[PDB]
Design a protein around this ligand. Sequence first.
Ligand code: YGR
Ligand code: YGR
Ligand code: YGR
Ligand code: YGR
Ligand code: YGR
Ligand code: YGR
Ligand code: YGR
Lengths: 117, 43, 34, 234, 81, 81, 81, 81, 81, 81, 81, 81, 81, 50
Amino acid sequence: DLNVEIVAVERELWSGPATFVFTRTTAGEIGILPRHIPLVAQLVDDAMVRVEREGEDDLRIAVDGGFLSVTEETVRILVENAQFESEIDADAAKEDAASDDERTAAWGRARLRALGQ
Amino acid sequence: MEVEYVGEYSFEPDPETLFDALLPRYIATRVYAALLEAAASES
Amino acid sequence: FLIPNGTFFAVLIIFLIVLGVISKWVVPPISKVL
Amino acid sequence: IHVGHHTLVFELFGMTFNGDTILATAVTAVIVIALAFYLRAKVTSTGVPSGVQLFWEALTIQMRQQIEGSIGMKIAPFVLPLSVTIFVFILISNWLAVLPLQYGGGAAAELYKAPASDINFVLALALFVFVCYHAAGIWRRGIVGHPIKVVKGHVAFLAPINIVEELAKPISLALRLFGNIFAGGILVALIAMFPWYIQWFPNAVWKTFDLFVGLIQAFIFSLLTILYFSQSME
Amino acid sequence: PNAIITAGALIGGGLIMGGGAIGAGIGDGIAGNALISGIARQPEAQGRLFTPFFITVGLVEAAYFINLAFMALFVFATPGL
Amino acid sequence: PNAIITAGALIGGGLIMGGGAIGAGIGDGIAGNALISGIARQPEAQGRLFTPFFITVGLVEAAYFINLAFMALFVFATPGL
Amino acid sequence: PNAIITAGALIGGGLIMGGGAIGAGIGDGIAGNALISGIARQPEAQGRLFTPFFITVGLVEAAYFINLAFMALFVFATPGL
Amino acid sequence: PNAIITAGALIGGGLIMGGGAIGAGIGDGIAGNALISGIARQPEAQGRLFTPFFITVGLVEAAYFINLAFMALFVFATPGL
Amino acid sequence: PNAIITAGALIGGGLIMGGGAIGAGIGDGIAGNALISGIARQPEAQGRLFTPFFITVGLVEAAYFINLAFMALFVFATPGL
Amino acid sequence: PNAIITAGALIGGGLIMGGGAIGAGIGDGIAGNALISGIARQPEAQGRLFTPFFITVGLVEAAYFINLAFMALFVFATPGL
Amino acid sequence: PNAIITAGALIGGGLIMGGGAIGAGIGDGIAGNALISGIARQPEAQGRLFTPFFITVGLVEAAYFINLAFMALFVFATPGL
Amino acid sequence: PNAIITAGALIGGGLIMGGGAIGAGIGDGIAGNALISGIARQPEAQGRLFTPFFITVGLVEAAYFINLAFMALFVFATPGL
Amino acid sequence: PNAIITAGALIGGGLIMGGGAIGAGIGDGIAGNALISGIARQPEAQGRLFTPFFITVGLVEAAYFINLAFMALFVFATPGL
Amino acid sequence: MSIFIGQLIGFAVIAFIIVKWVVPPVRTLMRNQQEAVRAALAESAEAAKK
Ligand SMILES: COc1cc([C@](O)(CCN(C)C)[C@@H](c2cc3cc(Br)ccc3nc2OC)c2cc(OC)nc(OC)c2OC)cc(OC)n1
Ligand SMILES: COc1cc([C@](O)(CCN(C)C)[C@@H](c2cc3cc(Br)ccc3nc2OC)c2cc(OC)nc(OC)c2OC)cc(OC)n1
Ligand SMILES: COc1cc([C@](O)(CCN(C)C)[C@@H](c2cc3cc(Br)ccc3nc2OC)c2cc(OC)nc(OC)c2OC)cc(OC)n1
Ligand SMILES: COc1cc([C@](O)(CCN(C)C)[C@@H](c2cc3cc(Br)ccc3nc2OC)c2cc(OC)nc(OC)c2OC)cc(OC)n1
Ligand SMILES: COc1cc([C@](O)(CCN(C)C)[C@@H](c2cc3cc(Br)ccc3nc2OC)c2cc(OC)nc(OC)c2OC)cc(OC)n1
Ligand SMILES: COc1cc([C@](O)(CCN(C)C)[C@@H](c2cc3cc(Br)ccc3nc2OC)c2cc(OC)nc(OC)c2OC)cc(OC)n1
Ligand SMILES: COc1cc([C@](O)(CCN(C)C)[C@@H](c2cc3cc(Br)ccc3nc2OC)c2cc(OC)nc(OC)c2OC)cc(OC)n1
């Protein structure tokens, strides 16, 4: 199986193995599953990550400025800032998405996508 | 930065643009490490 | 109709004239405007 | 469809001349000369440029940029006038055919047939360019050095291929211009076989697109002239 | 005897234009595919891509129009007749 | 004599139209593949991508048109008739 | 006499359909490849990706249709018959 | 007699099937290439990709059937017979 | 009279299988290119790549098979003979 | 009469071989291009890549072989003779 | 007898020129696609890319005109006439 | 009789070699495209890439060789003559 | 008698060079696309990439040469005259 | 006679097409360029005055 680790710049966000990972790279969506070739990919400013945890439910994460890496042992998601699906506030994300600033609007819309709006 | 060479993958959308976009992040994370370590030394 | 003719020269001459004029009337003036 | 049969044909100096092609070339030359003279009279460095000044400036800038990006302007100052005159000559020759200068005999006759539709015109332009950049290569490399580089090219063991490609440079550069305009002369003739009440539609669309086709052909011919010069000078 | 030569010339000219059209269409499509891909990746590159484009087109069109010319020679001025 | 020339002209026009259809269809497919890929990559570039497209389509569709004309010459106005 | 013309017209129509089918199939395949790749890379693009597609298909289906028409002329209304 | 007409019809229908087979095979292979690449790059999208796929395969395989509808017309009906 | 029809049928069947083999080979090659590239890039999805593969091949191999069948009908059961 | 059928069968077998060779060469080239790229970017993956590749080459070389068979049936065991 | 010779020579020269047109146009389109893509990615590489490009085109054009050189030999010299 | 069979055999062998050359050239071009891309991306892969390449070329040239042989059989040992 | 033989030889040689031209042009264009892409992506690699290139063009242009040679045998030394 | 009338209708169509869809963009380019150059000369003059 994949050893999935999500590493925020300030801390190691989450390091649970999973069967399948999914996210929108700058070149389009990408789905990583065991024994994928090594890869490095910049995620779109509003990318979101789905991790298909084997036992528990799916794990949907909003990510800001993420970089995905694939290696035979692990799948890394390096992150500037991230939030799991449960902690997202829909109104706050909507308010941020209306901002003209690219970074804040991108983060808000990423939070919306992870929330499943 | 000096480019370091030592004795002994795929990329999207190409290696050059990704490298250019990543170097600022490397600068930011090294400055972050410097600030964290300065806070520790200050304490 | 693919066989050349005397018109060949009759064309070349004319073209040369233009090549001359544009070489000085337009080369000079254009370069000057530039 | 009665291809060929150049009208106004005459004989002089013991050789035959297609009068209609010469007349079309002269018409194009006088249009280009009028544009050049109107520029010369109204060329302003400090004032607001006229329409002809803007046209000439854009064309000269494009050709100069091509020369800069292919072979330095210092090495090739003489090729900018050649490119500009070539472009304007072919462009005006092709675009003057858009005028409704055709009528019915009962076959269709055309008062102004694009000179490029004649083999002599395109062959003359191509051979002039051929001699010009071969002479430029001789000047920049030497009488004996230039042929050696031309045959060798960039790969020595491909010597015959080069010798073909070289001979292909004029031929194509001529025929590419020939067939494109020659073909048009047939379509307008073919479309003339239609009755007037449905002839205008195919004729209209064909000539509307032939404006762009002639523009692109003039641009391509000039661009390939510049490219061949850059190749043959170094 | 002239009828057989004329029919053969018509078939040969049809072959010439069929090959020329195939080559022109496919090569122009490929060159324009490169042009459109470049302008999609770098929309500000359009101006600089028309030079290498019309060069390429200039080459491709040649293979067509040369052929076109020769079809006329096949059709209107059949080499044998 | 007329029958042979007419049959040869029909075959030549069939070749002309087959080649023209192949070239036009494949070139249009390639150019539109570039257009679709670009508009997938850069939706905001949609309009900017329609300039190099219609030029490319203009180049192939021109050839096709010429072909469609010459077949009309072969079939209805058999030159060697 | 009419037998030769009819056989030539049938061969020409067969060529027209062969070329039209090749062009239509390959161009539609290429355009659909672009569409499928675009939809795979991102779902929300689908709505827009059908505008360039149906344009390209419209160009590739037109050519076929034109050929489809001319065979109908070649075989049912054989010119020069 | 019409034996020449029958031979011409057989050759024409053979051309129709040859072109239709080439176009269908190559075009649907290109569409399947897109489908396989999309599923490989995003295995969870399989069903999604089957919408555009079967559209282009619908266009590519339609051209075949139409050709199949005409070869049958050529050899079994032979309109010019 | 039967000799001419037989020769025409042989030529038509040759065309049928020529087109069928071209389409089959090229389409199978393209689909296999997709499969090999996807297995190289996403080896774990090898199984999920075979459903869209055998489908595509299933289409391609269908186009060939039909053609082959008709070739038989052309050569062994020559219509109009 | 046998001469006409033999000439037609030779032409048809030549068509079958031309189509089979085109399809086999191009499909093998495409599959091998996939294999070469996969082994370039994944040096240790070549083993796995040889599984789909030989499948693809299986479907390609198969078609060729079938053609190679029927040409013999056309040339040595001419059905119509 | 010379009528059959001239018709066959014209058809052979038409085949030569059609194949040359197809090969030259498509190969030039592919090489120019590479050139345009490389210039779009790295404009400064323009002058660098024209060295290999004009080698490859230099070969492709040589395939064309050599064929043309032979077509003349078919139609104007007609060996075996 | 003999003349007709010989002419048909010559045309069939010409078709054999034309298809074989098309397949060989295009397959070699595609395989060498993969080889060149791999060597450009992976210098040290140059040694490892020549094994798949030689396999691909082996599958391509073999087809050509086979065609060549049969073409000889057509023109030097014309069956049915 | 000889007239038909050498007319068929002319058509067969035209087919040989048509196929050779198509294969050589397209394969050289594809190999040149690879070389140009490699030089654009790896400017310092040019000297290296000419060894894989000329090998590829070596196999491609070889086929053409053979075809050319055989056309001479077809045309100037036609078998079975 | 008829050929001339048909071609003249076609040329009227061509003129209408270029005037409606081709002339406007070319005129906009010329006005942006010529007008812009006028503006620039003006700016240069004002700057010299300054
Ligand atoms: C059923 O619809 C059509 C369309 C056509 C076209 O040829 C396109 C066919 N193709 C897509 C395969 C078409 C055309 C012509 C062009 C000519 C030049 Br030069 C340059 C670009 C062109 N682009 C073109 O379409 C983008 C055309 C031709 C024409 O002829 C009198 N009148 C038109 O009306 C303005 C016309 O546009 C609709 C033809 C036709 O007749 C059988 N039926
Ligand atoms: C199975 O059904 C069909 C379909 C057709 C088509 O040609 C498409 C075939 N293809 C998919 C291979 C089809 C068509 C025509 C188009 C013409 C232009 Br210009 C531009 C786009 C087109 N797109 C088209 O389909 C997307 C068509 C043709 C037609 O002819 C009188 N009438 C139609 O009814 C409006 C029609 O639409 C259904 C033909 C046919 O004949 C046997 N049978
Ligand atoms: C020497 O072996 C073969 C194989 C064939 C095939 O056509 C493959 C051709 N290919 C490789 C180009 C083959 C086939 C047919 C298919 C039909 C459809 Br619809 C969809 C998928 C198919 N997939 C197929 O192969 C996976 C086939 C045909 C057939 O005909 C009665 N009987 C079969 O059962 C034994 C059979 O194998 C399932 C034909 C043949 O004839 C000389 N000889
Ligand atoms: C092996 O069996 C087949 C299959 C066909 C097809 O043509 C596909 C062939 N191809 C894969 C090469 C096929 C078909 C037709 C389509 C028509 C349009 Br419009 C749009 C999409 C189509 N997609 C199709 O399959 C994806 C078809 C045609 C048909 O006509 C008698 N009856 C069918 O139902 C009984 C049928 O199956 C739905 C033909 C055939 O000929 C003997 N034998
Ligand atoms: C020695 O060179 C060859 C090779 C062949 C092949 O056809 C491959 C041709 N290729 C390059 C297009 C080849 C073949 C056949 C296959 C059939 C099916 Br179904 C599925 C896969 C196949 N894979 C194959 O090769 C991987 C073949 C055929 C055959 O027939 C009597 N005897 C063979 O054993 C000696 C044989 O080699 C295994 C033919 C030939 O003609 C004289 N000469
Ligand atoms: C006037 O120029 C040419 C060149 C040729 C070539 O065939 C290439 C044609 N192509 C580029 C389309 C050429 C050739 C042959 C090769 C043979 C093998 Br095996 C492998 C690679 C080859 N590569 C080749 O060029 C890359 C060739 C042929 C030849 O004929 C006796 N003598 C040669 O040496 C003196 C020779 O080399 C230069 C033919 C020709 O005929 C009119 N005229
Ligand atoms: C250079 O001049 C040649 C070359 C050939 C080849 O066919 C290759 C042609 N191609 C590149 C277009 C060649 C060949 C044959 C192969 C057969 C199989 Br199965 C599998 C791979 C092959 N690879 C091959 O080269 C990669 C060949 C054939 C042969 O037969 C008499 N004798 C050979 O030994 C001397 C031989 O090698 C040189 C033929 C020929 O004849 C006119 N002249």
